[PDB]
Amino acid sequence: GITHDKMYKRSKTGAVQGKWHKKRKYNLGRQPANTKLIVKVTSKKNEGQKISTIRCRGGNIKRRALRLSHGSFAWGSADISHKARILQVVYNSTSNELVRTNTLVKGCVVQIDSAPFKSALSNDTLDKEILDQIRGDHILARISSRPGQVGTADGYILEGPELLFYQKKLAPK
Template sequence: MGITRTSRHKRSASGAQRAHYRKKRKFELGRQSAQTRIGAKRIHTVRVRGGNLKYRALRLESGNFAWASEHCTRKTRIIGVVYNSSNNELVRTNTLVKSAVIQIDAAPFRQWFEAHYAQPVTKKGKQTVVEEKEEKKLSNHAQRKVDERKKDAKIDPLLESQFAAGRLYALISSRPGQSGRADGYVLEGKELEFYLRKLRTGKHSKHG
């Protein structure tokens, strides 16, 4: 029997089984979920209604992630799934789905921050960047620009600790099984606090 997206097979509110009055139709069909895992990129195309194509990602290893407060988007490596509000099994198996909380490599964002603000992301043990910058004498115009930027170079302490560990928490906002991509945004502010609380209460099996 094929997967179908109707409720004709469901019992009625009183518990009675519904009588069959027609067969399944092609336009009601459903398909198995993609169960996108982490690995070397593997995408299948699926021909769908209207002759259109869907891109079913079976394996993905990276995606575009936006750091909203800094207006910065970078392609970065996906490390693992750490939380999923719908199903712990998807965390255990590292399955990429929309709204899954994942860990991504912080390096591209660190490089951008240090180039943009000419100062390290974390306070501790990262003086080398500043020293290198001092050696390169900037023109007055460039120096003014950097000084202006430094006024806004504040970073959330929660994000700072993640940068120190080299991994950021992010949320997938695309649908890997439909679009073939795992894109999303870096968690920060109230949303990050919310998910960190969830992670601490152990409502999932944690993978680093």
């Protein structure tokens, strides 16, 4: 019964708009997916990453992710891409309450294990700052994929002014 029609909403003036129809299955919206992480592998290993699949109007299926673990992350200015497990979620624009639960949302800044990206550090002088993150086992990456709309969490390693901005916000914690 969750619906995205504007029949139940007011006008520009703020006038009540009379309802002329009952709910439509063409206007329905499904409940939101909380894409948690398998962060605590100790007691979360008992549930492998699970991606559900929901039928949609047209019969086309949208895979929706319930629990995720790893996604393709790419260092663009180095052309180094590897599948990396997501260690932790930090700093979301929508709410920092989400960050506590680790629920993944497109645009959340995550931390990924640098062990897959180890070869790039040995390759000489790739960028500068990102190399230090590879030397320490945590690299910041933004999830660029919508978990729950494709059931995947791929992303990009943060670089440039964006990396600095995110780090500055996360400096005290």
